[PDB]
Structure formats: C-alpha cells, structure tokens
Amino acid sequence: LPEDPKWEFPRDKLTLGKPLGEGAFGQVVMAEAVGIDKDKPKEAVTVAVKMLKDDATEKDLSDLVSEMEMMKMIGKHKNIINLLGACTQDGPLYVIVAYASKGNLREYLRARRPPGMINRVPEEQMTFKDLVSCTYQLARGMEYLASQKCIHRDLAARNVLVTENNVMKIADFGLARVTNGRLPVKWMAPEALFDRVYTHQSDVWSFGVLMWEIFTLGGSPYPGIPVEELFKLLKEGHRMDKPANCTNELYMMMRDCWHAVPSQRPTFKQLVEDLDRILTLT
Ligand SMILES: Nc1ncnc2c1ncn2[C@@H]1O[C@H](COP(=O)(O)OP(=O)(O)CP(=O)(O)O)[C@@H](O)[C@H]1O
Ligand SMILES: [Mg+2]
C-alpha cells in the first residue's frame, strides 16, 4: 500500500475511542488526533476514523482505498465532511475525517420530532425553518460537488451528518465517481436503474428523495412499497405524496427533481437559488 506523504498521519498521535457506526464494508470509530489540523498544530482534535471490520474482504479494503482517494479529490466545503488525514503504512488503513457529534441526519430529525409521531431531544424540536435551512445547506454542498465533477450516487439522509453547530455535512463517498448495481434503489433516478447512466441530474433526483426524508423528519421513502415493486411504479409515473410539513412550493421542487426527463430537472445551482429565496421568507 503506497504512501501519500501530504495526507499521512502518524499512528502514535491517534487514540481510538467509542464506535460511532458500522455496516458491511467497514466501521467508524471516534478518535483523538494530536496535531492533525495544521491550523492549530499543537491541539488534540476529535475526529472520526473509518476502518475495515475483522470480517472484511479484499473488495472492502479496495473500496476503502477508493473512498479515501475520492475525498482527496473533492476538496473542502462547509457542507461536506472533509478528509483530515490517513494512516496507510504499518498497520490497518485509517481514513481520518471530521467528527459530526449529532450523528446522521435521518437520526437527528427523528429524535427532534413533535409529540405524537431513548434518543429524543425534545428541547431541539424541528421548526419548519430548520427544515428548509437543512435543505439549503445540503443543496449548497451538492452544488459544490457537481462543480468539482463529482457524482455522489448515494445521497440519503443516513449519509448526511450533523455537527455540534447543526451544520449539515454530506458524507459517505464510497460510491462517488468523476453497472450502478450497488446503489440503493429507493434513492436512484430511473435512468440510473434502467439505462445504467449517472449524471449530476441523477443526483438531483436523489436530492428530491432526500428532501422528502427531511420534510417527513426522517421517514422511509416509498413507505409500504417493496424495492422489488418500485421499478414498475416509477416507469408508470408514480411519485411520493406530499409530506404534511411540506409546503406546496417545496413539494413542487421535489417533483421537479423527479421529472422523468433528466435534462429537465433543476440544477443544484437553481435549487440553491430557489431555496435561498424560500429561506429568506421564513
Ligand atoms: N464523521 C462522522 N462523525 C460521526 N459519526 C459518523 C461519522 N461518519 C459516519 N458516522 C456514523 O456512522 C454511520 C455510517 O457511516 P458511513 O455512511 O460513512 O458508513 P457506511 O454506510 O459506508 C457503512 P457500510 O458500507 O459497511 O454499510 C453514519 O450514518 C454515522 O451515523
Ligand atoms: Mg451509507
């Protein structure tokens, strides 16, 4: 495994902590990184470390490598979880990213639901403005990703992180690129599912589902519809209903992201424009 000296971080300066999240390509662990942030080279920084699980396969290691390299290409942005360094030599591969203390977006929202709908934070109940602000931030992050020639391909509320300052951060770049068989079906545009094509306009379709996840405060898309039956219903023009806490203005935005003709969906730029207007009148 070849070293990248710009990004390499000394293992002895990294202290691993509690698990934060896990799946079947790797796990995420809280850690402390002494000197990783060279704007403050003396300071310990709380970070997140992505690493293989004990039952990892070779493909898992390959995928983790690809994810690290994709995050080097992406760059830095307010609304994107950023790469801080890596441990690649003499030990397990550690990909060190910024820490988001309030967890993933789906799970921030569900804990901040109104009454009547172990983890609840009722003190921080979501307002309608919080939701549009959430959406504005994520549209900003996607506008930047597209400007850097990057398709995310796995946009979803579970792949958004929330910092201690409630800043939305797009995360999990394991599927990102400059088949499509590994993309979650309920978030995918039909041209991605059917024609094996992925553009920025496919990400705009996923953004619409993400919008729906947000205005349901973390609901599950196409509820009661199994993935197997979703292929047919999309080809017949089915779309999700308006969430209650969603304006019709914002509902038409979702529907514009879900246009059958991809070149006809909004751009992330236009979505940022529109959301900025809506956010200003709340
Ligand atoms: N920088 C971070 N700070 C705090 N928590 C994080 C984090 N990164 C990830 N997590 C937590 O771990 C969860 C999984 O993160 P992530 O989406 O990167 O892994 P993953 O989905 O590729 C696992 P797999 O591919 O094995 O199924 C997140 O939803 C989040 O709750
Ligand atoms: Mg994920």
Numbering used by the authors: 468 to 584, 590 to 650, 661 to 764
Sentences from the paper on this structure:
Receptor tyrosine kinase (RTK) signaling fulfills fundamental functions in development, tissue homeostasis, and metabolism of metazoan organisms. The FGFR subfamily of tyrosine kinases has emerged as an excellent model system to elucidate the molecular basis underlying allosteric regulation of RTKs in a physiologically relevant and unbiased fashion. Our data reveal two clusters of hydrophobic interactions, termed ‘DFG latch’ and ‘αC tether’, which relay allosteric signals between the A-loop and the molecular brake. These hydrophobic networks, located strategically at the interface between the N- and C-lobes of the kinase, sense the structural fluctuations in the A-loop and molecular brake and undergo rearrangements to determine the kinase interlobe angle and hence kinase activation.
